[PDB]
């Protein structure tokens, strides 16, 4: 069946004018389609927006709009709000079955840009006792929510034994992420490096340990 | 005021069976089809399962034809999923979802699967201290990695809930068919090593609890 895709994550400002689209493998969007935008705001609250490729739902504000656009069905928010920074599933409806996106993260700028705070943990004497040890690398208060890490054992980069979380946002609405190394102690014990590497915004900030 | 409610979820083993309940209300539940979605642990959004106004269509994707089986009693306003043959790719939130002429805009507040054949295990403790006395700052940032456990959740406080400010507390990973999940605290460099500063885990599902002093 069909591959839907959408843009991974944008970002704007606030009063400006988004467009999001979303693509079928199948060839090309159509009326008969459907195309709906869902929106999820925190704590797994979901909201249909538009249906029927362009009708919008009641309560919806305004400024949200849908269209189809170069064979994708798209959705525009014109004067894009704060409130607006949420993550936009777009689904589509082939002959019964509904098939979705995998969803786009939009950022609309509600506060400067801030760069993540990043700590490096050493595994601890307790878990290295069981033949085991993790590396923790917790990064905080960045904004905007993505980031990219890379870990690194003596230069080389790593390639497996990593797991990454998925940015959540904090308190402040800036958000927060923790990335894992797992190795065996005996491992450990073999390398004498270890980095993390958090890339923000087109900079990198590494922490790393001897 | 439109509402879906959906239950029945909680945790299964593989090759069991379930039944999910979407009870509607405010406004003629017969005249809209409706469409169960699921979201999974990766975030990903599934359409499950959809059934016409009346009944009559019903319609899934190949990963749950023939195990799960949607129908709908009109009379007491209530969508359901039977699911059987349970699978660990199965486990989710389920959301009950109405389509109000091809737009679906009301979504309930959704129930969670866990399909999962681990038995019931409490977390082990271990600190997570700077590892340097190249102490970035006049703050130092200190943890507890609190690992295997199952199933969720685990709280996390600090010093008994007196040290509550700048604490963070990450989402659980699964490793290997069990959670592990981070807490971490940011104090001032005066306090640390000076005063005591301990991570209280608590896992409901094992009633255990356990305190880990962070030490240099
Ligand atoms: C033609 O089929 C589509 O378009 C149809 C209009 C939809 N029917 C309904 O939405 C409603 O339940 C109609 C109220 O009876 C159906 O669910 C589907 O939505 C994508």
């Known amino acids: 069946q069909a591959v839907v895709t959408q843009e991974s994550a944008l970002t704007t400002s606030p009063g400006e004018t988004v467009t999001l689209t979303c693509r079928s493998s199948?060839?090309?969007?159509?009326?008969?389609?459907?195309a709906n935008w869902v929106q999820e705001k925190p704590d797994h609250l979901f909201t249909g927006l538009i249906g029927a490729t362009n009708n919008r739902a009641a309560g919806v504000p305004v400024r949200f709009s849908g269209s189809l656009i170069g064979g994708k069905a798209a959705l525009t928010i014109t004067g894009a709000q704060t409130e607006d920074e949420a993550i936009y599933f777009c689904?589509?409806?082939?002959?019964?079955?509904?098939?979705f996106g995998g969803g786009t993260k939009l950022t609309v700028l509600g506060q400067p840009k801030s760069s993540p705070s990043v700590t490096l943990f050493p595994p601890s004497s307790e878990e290295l006792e069981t033949n085991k040890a993790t590396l923790v690398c917790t990064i905080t208060d960045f904004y905007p929510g993505v980031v990219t890490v890379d870990w690194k054992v003596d230069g080389t980069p790593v390639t497996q034994g990593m797991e990454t979380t998925n940015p959540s946002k904090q308190s402040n609405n800036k958000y927060m992420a923790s990335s894992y190394l797992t190795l065996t102690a005996r491992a450990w014990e073999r390398h004498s490096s270890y980095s993390c590497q958090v890339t923000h915004e087109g900079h990198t900030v590494e922490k790393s340990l001897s | 005021e439109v509402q879906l409610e959906e239950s029945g979820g909680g945790l299964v083993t593989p090759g069991g069976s379930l039944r999910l309940s979407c009870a509607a209300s405010g406004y003629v539940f017969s005249t809209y089809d409706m469409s169960w979605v699921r979201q999974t642990p990766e975030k990903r959004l599934e359409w499950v399962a959809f059934i016409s106004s009346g009944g009559g269509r019903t319609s899934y994707p190949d990963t749950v034809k023939g195990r799960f089986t949607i129908s709908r009693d009109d009379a007491k306003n209530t969508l359901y999923l039977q699911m059987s043959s349970l699978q660990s790719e199965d486990t989710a939130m389920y959301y009950c979802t109405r389509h109000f002429y091809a737009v679906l805009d009301y979504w309930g507040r959704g129930t969670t699967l866990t399909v999962s054949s681990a038995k019931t295990t409490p977390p082990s403790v271990y600190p997570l201290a700077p590892g340097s006395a190249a102490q970035t700052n006049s703050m130092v940032t200190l943890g507890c990695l609190v690992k295997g456990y199952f199933p969720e959740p685990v709280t996390v406080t600090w010093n008994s809930g007196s040290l509550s400010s700048g604490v963070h507390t990450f989402p659980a990973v699964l490793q290997s068919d069990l959670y592990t999940l981070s807490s971490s605290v940011t104090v001032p460099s005066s306090t640390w090593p000076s005063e005591t500063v301990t991570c209280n885990v608590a896992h409901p599902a094992s009633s255990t609890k356990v305190d880990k002093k962070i030490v240099p």
């Open positions: 199948t060839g090309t969007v159509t009326t008969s389609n459907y």
């Open positions: 689904a589509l409806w082939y002959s019964g079955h509904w098939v």
